[PDB]
Design a protein around this ligand. Structure first.
Ligand SMILES: O=S(=O)(c1ccc(O)cc1O)N1Cc2ccc(NC3CCNCC3)cc2C1
Ligand SMILES: O=S(=O)(c1ccc(O)cc1O)N1Cc2ccc(NC3CCNCC3)cc2C1
Lengths: 338, 338
């Protein structure tokens, strides 16, 4: 009773995704339904059109085809709601059930796509042109996915504000991530570095809080602690005294910056880019979480000494706007030294 | 008696520049002459072809036309030597005189091009497409120029190895740059931060030395000290105690890294890119000096606290290879979010 999926994909891919600010999220169920039965199809269709620009070699892999098939079914699942009445309580409850089913369907997207990359390399061998396309695509695909999960989680949790903490204590999240990383480091190495936190609240020399999704911040910090701890222990195999991991949390007028400093011996500059290369997606996905609300995650090493990692977040909820890829000419097109 | 310049430009722009390593420089006058009467025309012609890809608006400015005219005359100056005998001592002495004349002719290229950029903005207004082209071009143009000056200085100084110190003591250059920056800071503010240097020689816990052009390293460090000192003093107007500027010099297996840390209050991430934008070229040109021998210069701030600047250099002279732009399809061609 639905049209073929390509007709829906072509229809909804003409629209641009609509980015929301953290303030908008933070600040009804019928309104959410009527918004999402347009917006989720727009976001699904825009990235499905980009999948189709991948090299034939990558698109031919079974795991990429599988993920594509999930996106198709999820789009069709929502098309079932196009003619349904928001005033009918049953529409709203069925819609929430459908979003839960979509979220579960897509639970394993990240490792399934990674298997697709491995299939491409195993079947054909990799080549730099395809690899550059894959890198460009996967950043956008995984950020798109983060944004779809955000919309679904907000709706299902609401019907904290959903997953958003309006008073997230950043140092508490740092400590939670440290604690969990320490459990893992202690398991494998029987030791771990200590934590030192310093806060710099420039305008109010007050604990630092923000509006944020704590799970996203935790995810980033946990990945950074795992790397910093492993570096510290493995670079100190002959020492019983481990240098601590030092975290600075700074609150400025526009940025809330979190620096994690280790004395793990570092890595040469040549190898920094590889750390964000898909060709263990912990670091690239962590950086996407930072970018999702107009932040960033940057690494700076001193080979022979150690590494600084900085999470840059927007301090203000009004500056914290979704960063969403859009399928258009610039995107389509995107697919000199001696 | 020479052909028209376009015939030479077309001829020599077909060749790629030939990058030399620091080791090759470090490791005859007739050989230098016969090399340079090919290589300097190749480098001049390759970048002259790129000037021609600039937007009409930029190319139409009098200061860009003036610089172009210098490059034309310098190319023709060298064409006078195509049929001259290297065995004749007079050829060699006349060649050195000609290179000195070229260097003097081009002494003011950097501010003259900057005046061209200002003329473009004043005459037409700037636009983002032209601005992106200008940014791409000027990085390559100024790196090309650095490389031409290197070749000329090596020849004229030789006929230290030319401008190269095979045993450059990095901390001594840091101190020289600090001293000169302190003179300026003291003049305007009647105070300046102190310097603290720490060395980390990972394999030989020995003063850190390298093969490098000390003037280039000095240039980078002087620019970084000026910024760090200004930030520190201006962010501490109510304090008599100034936080020091801390420099770490680290020697690893592949990198020699120099970090300059200040507590000058920093800058929001949004504004970092502007610091390397031509649209006061001290920071972008300093980064080009770092890139010239396969290094880099990176800035990382914590708004509300301060800024780290890192100069990344290659530790080994065999890894220190000229980074040269080349005129080819990729370069010619070079001229998606919500
Ligand atoms: O790349 S890293 O500098 C880094 C990246 C990310 C980040 O967030 C933090 C970081 O420090 N770093 C991780 C790591 C892990 C293991 C080892 N083992 C080496 C084995 C041989 N002997 C020396 C130690 C070294 C390093 C170095
Ligand atoms: O951008 S920077 O962080 C920077 C860039 C480069 C670099 O190598 C080092 C750096 O620190 N920095 C330079 C500078 C210069 C002047 C001021 N004056 C402000 C006026 C209003 N009150 C606060 C101070 C601030 C800053 C900040």
């Amino acid at each position: 009773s639905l049209a073929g999926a390509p007709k829906y994909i072509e229809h909804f891919s003409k629209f641009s995704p609509s980015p929301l600010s953290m303030k908008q999220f933070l600040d009804c169920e019928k309104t959410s339904f009527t918004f999402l039965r347009q917006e989720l199809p727009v976001r699904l269709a825009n990235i499905m059109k980009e999948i189709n620009l991948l090299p034939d070699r990558v698109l031919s892999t079974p795991s990429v085809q599988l993920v594509q098939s999930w996106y198709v079914q999820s789009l069709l699942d929502i098309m079932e709601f196009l003619d349904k009445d928001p005033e009918d309580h049953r529409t709203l409850s069925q819609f929430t059930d459908a979003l839960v089913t979509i979220r579960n369907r897509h639970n394993d997207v990240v490792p399934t796509m990674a298997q697709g990359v491995l299939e491409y390399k195993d079947t054909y061998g990799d080549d730099p042109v395809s690899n550059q396309n894959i890198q460009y695509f996967l950043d956008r695909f995984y950020l798109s996915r983060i944004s779809i999960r955000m919309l679904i989680n907000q709706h299902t949790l609401i019907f904290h504000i959903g997953s958003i903490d309006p008073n997230c204590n950043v140092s508490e999240v740092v400590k939670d991530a440290y604690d969990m990383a320490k459990l893992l480091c202690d398991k494998y190495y029987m030791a771990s570095p200590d934590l030192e936190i310093q806060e710099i609240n420039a305008a109010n020399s007050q604990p630092i809080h923000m509006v944020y999704v704590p799970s996203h911040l935790y995810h980033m910090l946990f990945e950074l602690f795992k790397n910093a701890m492993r570096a510290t222990v493995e670079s100190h195999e002959s020492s019983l005294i481990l240098p601590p991991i030092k975290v600075m949390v700074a609150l400025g007028e526009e940025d809330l910056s979190i620096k994690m400093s280790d004395r793990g011996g570092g890595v040469p500059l040549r190898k920094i880019e590889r750390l964000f290369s898909y060709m263990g997606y912990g670091l690239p996905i962590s950086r996407l979480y930072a970018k999702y609300f107009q932040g960033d995650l940057q690494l700076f090493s001193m080979e022979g000494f150690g590494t600084d990692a900085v999470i840059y977040l927007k301090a203000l909820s009004t500056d914290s706007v979704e960063r969403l890829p859009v399928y258009n000419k610039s995107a389509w097109r995107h697919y000199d030294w001696c």
